[PDB]
A paper describes a structure:
The V. cholerae T4aP secretin PilQ is a member of the bacterial secretin superfamily. Bacterial secretins are united by a common C-terminal secretin domain, which oligomerizes to form a large pore in the outer membrane. During natural transformation, the T4aP extends and retracts a filament to take up DNA cargo.
Here, we present the structure of the V. cholerae T4aP secretin PilQ to ~2.7 Å using a fully functional, His-tagged allele that we express and purify from the native bacterium. The cryoEM structure (C14 symmetry, overall resolution of 2.7 Å at Fourier shell correlation (FSC) of 0.143, and 3 Å at FSC of 0.5) reached sufficient, isotropic resolution to recognize and model residues 160–571 of VcPilQ, which includes the N0, N3, and secretin domains. Once assembled, VcPilQ forms a 56-strand beta barrel. In VcPilQ, a 32 Å alpha helix follows the N0 domain. Following the end of this helix, the protein chain changes direction (~104° angle) as the coil flows into the N3 domain. This dramatically reduces the channel diameter, from 90 Å at the bottom of the N0 domain to 60 Å across the N3 domain. In our VcPilQ structure, the inner channel distance between the corresponding glycine (G439) alpha carbons is about 8 nm.
Residue numbers in the entry:
A (entry chain K): 365 to 416
B (entry chain G): 365 to 571
C (entry chain K): 469 to 520
D (entry chain F): 417 to 468
The structure:
Amino acid sequence: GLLADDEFPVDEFLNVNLASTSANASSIAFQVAKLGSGTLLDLELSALQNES
Amino acid sequence: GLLADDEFPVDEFLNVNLASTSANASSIAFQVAKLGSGTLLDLELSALQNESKAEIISSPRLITTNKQPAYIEQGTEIPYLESSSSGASTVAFKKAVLSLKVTPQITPDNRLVLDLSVTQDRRGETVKTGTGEAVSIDTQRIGTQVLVNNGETVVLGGIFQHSINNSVDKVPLLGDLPVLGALFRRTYEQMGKSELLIFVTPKVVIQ
Amino acid sequence: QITPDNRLVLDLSVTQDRRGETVKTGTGEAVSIDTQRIGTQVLVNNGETVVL
Amino acid sequence: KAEIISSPRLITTNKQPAYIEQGTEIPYLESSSSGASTVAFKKAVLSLKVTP
């Protein structure tokens, strides 16, 4: 109950934040959310490969 | 009950505040909060480690007649604001090119004497000049006279660089304990290395 | 220039430039140019190619 | 702590001047002749200049 503003700290949530930084990168993301025992875990992969 | 504004003093709360200051640093944080007896304790670790490599090669060529000057270029021409003669401005162009400029000479015992200029410049940042701005240039240049056998290579010059940095900030006595000390200190370490080389090789066209 | 033994001496300039970005000059702006240039004197047989 | 090392090299002919450079050229606002401005470039380079 300690912090005042509570919608979701999307940036304070993440442990490892090393996303592929581009405009055409493709991703996919998996989740496990209980909310009864509290546990939540998220995992997203992203990639890109081009040629010219 | 003494202070008026109470949501949480997140900055006055922390005892030791030595977080890894970067944009790609990864962390993890543990907590023990009772709120019945009042006790609260927080501990967060953060880290980062990266690494990089690069390599560039460029090679221009020319053919020419003995004792005759030749050049080949590729780059940009930057318009600069004014050139001054007796009274007014002929605004001119500076070059930022990868260029080769040469005059050769053939000698009797199968050898060449070369008068050499080789450059590789680029367009840099835009600095502030007076109330205005202008564009700066990043350069690499070598100019020489050398004497080289007919069909082999020589290295004209090069530049080598190396650098190492270390830093620590800690708590005066605790940040030195054998295994626990890592809880009381921030550590930073960086290393760089660079190397540049220039080669040349002439050849007489035997028809 | 044509020589006796079926050969040419050429004084050559060949360029290919384009219009580049618009850089900042003083309180104003101007247009920059992207260049490729080669200038030489060569000696070549009558009807064949050489790389300059 | 800190430590930096830099070493340029050259080869040249006896009694003949040679140089090698690496750095930037700063455009400065104006150079003055009899009347007007030829804005010029100052150098900020790591350079070696030698006559043996």
